[PDB]
Each structure stands twice: as C-alpha cells, then as structure tokens.
C-alpha cells in the first residue's frame, strides 16, 4: 500500500483443478463438488447440498483450505450462491430452510484434520446466518428460474498466521458458486 489496493487471498473461480475442501460428517446428502459456469462461460468449481427430504435436520459442513492472512487485520469474504425455494422441492417438508451459516477459525499453521477444528461453534466463530433475498424456483416440467445472491462478510480482527472458513447447512438446498477472500492493502 505504497500503492493502495485490494489484494486477493483466495478466489475459487481461479481454481483450475479441484478445490479439495473438506466435508463432515460425509453421510448421505453430503456437500458435493460440481463443475459450474461463470459469467464468461468458463468452467469453475462449485459446491452444492440439497438434503431436504431424507434428513433436513442433518448438518453438513464444508471447510476451505488454510488461508495465510499476510498483513490483513480484517478480511472480506464475498459469497455468491443460489438458494432454492423450499416450496419448489417435492417432499421437502416443514423443516426445510433457506439459509446457511458462515464461520471462521484462526490457526497458526495448517493443522486441520478430518475431525478438527471441532465441527461446531466454539471453536468456530459464527460470522452470520446468511439469508437469501432471491429464491430460485422450479415448476414441474420446466427450467429453473432465479437470481444469484451475493453477501460480503467482514472477518476479524485477525491475529494468527492463517484461517479456515466453514459453512454449515442443515436442511437447505443451495449452490455455493464462488468465494473470494480479499483485504485492503
């Protein structure tokens, strides 16, 4: 910031192979990585989950790789996502949700495992339960119609060498189309 600018820490749309994000507990209905398309019609890695019929009360977790924070005291996280209208999903029931919750946890090295940091608030720091202003609709026989949602969250103040972001779903039906972490330098 001898020249002032925003500096990227992570941009999923630039991943050319697979993201390798870690999921838990890896049961039926788990988060799945899928190839999607961005605004330039280029292939990008995305994550989807839609466990609304079988077990809408089962939590499904998704964790990023470890992100070294460099000088950053606050980091911004821009999330772009589709959220299905519960009423469009056949045999979704009363338990279906139209939100997901975003957490982070700071660590001094990339020490996470399949089971740790423990998959729960504390250690994870709850940032926001994110609502969707735009619901995607699908009517029998027809193409889905909808808009993409965007939410930017501010994380910090940060003090350890790096951090993980984690997403908790429980009975929602959504596609995480992109994550971009950046800070002001």
């Amino acid at each position: 910031h001898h020249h002032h600018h925003e500096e990227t820490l992570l941009n999923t749309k630039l991943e050319t192979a697979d993201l390798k994000w870690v999921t838990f507990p890896q049961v039926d209905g788990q988060w799945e990585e899928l190839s999607g398309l961005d605004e330039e019609q280029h292939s990008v890695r995305t994550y989807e989950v839609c466990d609304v019929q079988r077990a809408p009360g089962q939590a499904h977790w998704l964790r990023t790789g470890w992100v070294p924070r460099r000088g950053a005291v606050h980091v911004y996280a821009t999330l772009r996502f589709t959220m299905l209208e519960c009423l469009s999903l056949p045999r979704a029931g009363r338990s279906c949700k139209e939100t997901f919750t975003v957490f982070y946890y700071e660590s001094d090295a990339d020490t996470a495992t399949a089971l740790t940091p423990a998959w729960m608030e504390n250690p994870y720091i709850k940032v926001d339960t994110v609502a969707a202003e735009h619901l995607t609709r699908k009517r029998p026989g027809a193409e889905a119609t909808g808009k993409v949602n965007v939410k930017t969250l501010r994380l910090g103040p940060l003090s350890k060498a790096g951090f993980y972001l984690a997403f908790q779903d429980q009975g929602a039906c959504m596609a995480l189309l992109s994550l971009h972490l950046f800070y002001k330098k």
């Binding site: 209905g29 799945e32 899928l34 190839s35 999607g36 398309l37 961005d38 995305t46 989807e48 989950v49 839609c50 466990d51 609304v52 019929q53 589709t82 299905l84 999903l89 056949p90 979704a92 995607t136 699908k138 029998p140 889905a144 909808g146 808009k147 993409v148 039906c173 959504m174 596609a175 189309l177």
Partner: peptide
Amino acid sequence: NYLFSPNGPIARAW
C-alpha cells in the same frame, strides 16, 4: 444464467 448443475444434488431433488 448458471444457477446449479444438471448432475448435482439439487437436480436430483426432481
């Protein structure tokens, strides 16, 4: 406007 995959858990809802 890409919203979700033809091959994922969302598509499987129908």
